[PDB]
């Protein structure tokens, strides 16, 4: 059975008014709204005056292979058609787009929200007046980056709602760094809430599921006493038969629903339908015996459609709207292609469908009817694909005192414009659900435990530099870390001795070793004919006057600064105070006389080249040293053995003065025999005092300054009796 | 009008037997072959015995919107159908795949080669028995990489043959490095051969065009006398009405055609069709009055279908083949789904089309009929998309002597298997058409002039290293290039002097300067009480004996090797032979006497520290030098001014001996007065001899060796009279 009424040019409709029983909520509630919407068009002079509209609507029986064998009665007049209206479901309007494409006919579906239907290179005569469902992974990914929740755990639903919603959620999740944790797919029952506790720092579940497979979750997560704050897509909606099981666990969620003001005058029409004043609809004499349970038992004559039984559908403002889309596009045809006329012209029999849909239906813009406060949001655009503007609502769940009941807290069209005083989630909080907060460069060794987007960031070493965001290494041996831990610094070395409370030492030692060396110059070179310059020698003792000041200044050319040529001189300077100041004064004391000078130099230069022998490979180097990771010193190329090789090898010479001090016994054991060991105690007792030191400050000069203080009167103290 | 004959289950066909006149070549020649192919199936007991086949074929009128309004007579029995055969064109079998998909019916097209029809997620009931045209950019890109032609210039054709062939040629061109040059698109006439001469190192044109827009090219490139060797796709084919205009310019091309042996017994059938023994076909009584020009003028009773007028079509082995595809798939149905029977069982009324095409039609494999030497290439596979195996032919154009006529030189199925003795292109050549051949690393500076794939490669510098394939830089100052020009080498420096035909010089100079210094030791230190050691001094002249050998060996510690401490000694060694060997022998010659020694040292050490003064900042360095890009020397840190500062500043001392040589006139001007300038001539005359040199080999010692030869007898030659 079907219904067709003629006219100037007619429309066509499909409507699910059978079930695989009359579908009394999604069926007749919609179909009798279209026939109301026609009867305003044929009685409004500001609309199409002469184009008297009729209709030819069928019964799509909610199954695809009954639509096709029904839809051919449209196309078998090419009772002509100008465009079908309506494919209600989303599998029944994908098999009358693959057969109304092939005959150049526009198709306007009033409810069918899916995502494949906007693939306009495959369904190129299809424009609908509901938003698709790639615009619900663009609210629940913009009321997550408004509350700064960045670690969620989503659960889909199996079939064709979830797998094209969630795979459109992740691709709008990476665009705001909102990175998910766990993605289960319910087709089990208690396991999907078992896996949703193993990440307990994720307190927001994005719930993208149907309206039947989101009772068995909530009735399971009330049978385990857990709690969350859910965001959920249109499967929840405002349907108040999803919380009547467990009115406590679902408290505090926020969800979305398609916004639609009810149409006012339609309730003043549809509540005046008695089945004796409706001789037009061939289903009204079978719907009336189903929502009243009669059999026209026996029907009552006083029965009517009151306001206690006819709460109208959510989607009625998407039929009365989306038949005015056709009755304004086809108003532009008769007033442009054939002007100066009212009736259908002769150029209307070739009803160019391809020129209709692609030119001046898809680019139309007009206010909605039956709405007060016009041009607020009541304009019906179409985008560049055939999908109307998405205007949602955000429903919160404020349990005000007595009964758990829903509430509206704002909406969005392109910018989420909430009212920020309904967050009633756990007790009163903004339940952040963000893991492992960003941290300071002091703890910049951020390493993740295997799961992405939250980590541990620990302080690595104070001698280390932050190499990367997830890597740090040491700034370097001889490179000290600065605050800019990417490129840190070098390390300041240490060799300073310019008055380190010790450099005044050799100055006063020169004031006692070299200043009293002029007292040697006051007597010893002042008498070269005295009996003191006789075979009891004093012209020999100019070589003690030469070493009177060089021994008083040996560390004066060592303790300044280890510059690699300058410190090599004092490396080569230990031998001069080993032979010509000590051993030359330890060779002439065997007591010829006329040739008594040359016998000394025959034994003096036996070690003058041996200092160059140890200077063969090592020498003229001032390499640096560092032990405790922040303490660095600048020293010389000298081992402890080689430092002993200058110390304990030249201290063997005291064995060459033990018996050698004691046929020339005369007045020489009293004074020059006295200093054979009492000057050597500065070398005997000071052997292990270098073995202990490592800073080497006072021992840097006490191997010289006490010994040269002995040298101020080794023989000149006994030569102080005359003059 | 149409034709339907009943049966157990029937097939359906579309055939272009009208033109937008009966299409007597592509029409009735094909349609009457299908009805022949049926009448062997209903009379072959090894085939389907009880399934008596009938047919119901229509007239697709070569236009899309006449196929659809014709094709609904198939689908209005769901006179039932089991699968349509045939969509002939390639726009008429893309509008009976978008309407036979929607009702689960397989479709087999016998000729329709295109590329969109293998998009089997959009046309999912479509299997054809011709190869598509993504398998003709896979022969003409494999008989280009067999003759090693790698630089071509292709010309497409506008519409839907070229733009889906050439855009499938480039994507099979980059896979073998065969890179194209110019891609014009003919929709002008003479300009497309104007642009095909501006790259005259491209002698092969890939010609991917139709059969009408490839006469206007050849009839233009004969009106400009040019020449090429063409490869061309199936637009040429073997059609001998494309060369009859210009039988000389097109000589030597090679082209492709779909291989099809003619069907033998069909010519023994179709040549027995009189229009009184054919009471079945409702077009045969209008085709007969068109290929005989009669009007059944007046027809002749003796007229018949002879062998002089019925040269059969190329594509008849693709209909008699591709109706046996259905009559072997549907043989497997009746012998599996309902075995132990011959007739159609009760489970045949639900003819499961989706279970038919996707399971055991697309995976079928069977020999072709009416062909001798079976199983050579006569098996009919289907690939994983619904496209048969591509088996072409490669036609060459050997002009044998008298007439230009085509010839077959081999074929390919998956491997191009030619016969390599037909290359008859210009005179007799393999016309390589490859630009700017690869070259040696000696010329590895390969830079392209703007056009890709051919370049110029030039030799860059012999002191340069090949950095990249298109970049070279210098190997380095102090880095010599090797043959491995990626990482070349360092450069060997030059400081060698170990017997460079000059080191024996100072050895013999020591044999005359230091060996005769022992002759000074033979007399001068052998008498310290003689009148020669008196106030006429000789104990002073030990300082001439000291400098007797050090002047004989000053370059002996300079000309060895410039090691940076060792050469610094000879840098510090010029002063000793400037004062104590020369100026100390130029200070005592003012003639006290008892203190005559200390007056000399008061003036001797006036320049002993001035050598350290110029050694303040510069010194102990041995930096290297190089001028002519392959010649490097190792020298010392010495400028020409500083080398003069050791030379011309110490040569001022001759002005301190001019008047100073001449109250002590005695016997001293004869010998020691003689050497005041005749030793200075070794310093006077040798001032500019350093200003010229840069190799410094003989002048490295002649500033010493002649002067020390004077020093062998400066005073000892006059002290040679006694002893
Ligand atoms: N357009 C809907 C949307 C629908 C849907 C809506 C909410 C929850 C589950 C659900 O199941 C799917 C699955 C795929 C595509 C669309 C949906 C339809 O039924 O197709 C529905 C408004 C139409 C009506 O029933 O009036
Ligand atoms: N299948 C063909 C192939 C055809 C074609 C072949 C050669 C040159 C030009 C040309 O034009 C196009 C353009 C697009 C797709 C196919 C073609 C057809 O006519 O469609 C032709 C074998 C069918 C027949 O005519 O019997
Ligand atoms: C993060 O979101 C909260 C939610 O109220 C907001 O107040 C806050 O300003 C956001 N953070 C920053 C750094 O802006
Ligand atoms: C390039 O192609 C020619 C064509 O005859 C072939 O003989 C030759 O071997 C090919 N080049 C190489 C390097 O194989």
Numbering used by the authors:
A (entry chain B), B (entry chain A): 31 to 50, 59 to 116, 140 to 248, 255 to 363, 371 to 665, 686 to 756, 762 to 822
From the paper:
Eight G protein-coupled metabotropic glutamate receptors (mGlus) are essential in sensing glutamate concentrations from the ten nanomolar to ten millimolar range in the brain. The mGlu3 is in high sequence homology with mGlu2, but mGlu3 is of greater interest because it is responsible for the detection of very low concentrations of glutamate.
The mutations W7826.50A and F6523.40A largely impaired the effect of VU0650786 through decreasing its potency (increasing its IC50) by more than 23 fold compared to the wild-type. Comparing the structure of antagonist/NAM-bound mGlu3 with that of antagonist-bound mGlu3 revealed that the inactive VFT regions of both structures showed open conformations. The extracellular tips of the TM4, TM5 and TM6 helices in antagonist/NAM-bound mGlu3 underwent outward shifting due to the binding of the NAM in the TMD. Upon NAM binding, the TMDs undergo a clockwise twist, which results in a closer distance between TM3/TM4 helices from the two subunits, similar as that observed in the antagonist/NAM-bound mGlu2, suggesting a new interface for fully inactive state in mGlu dimers.
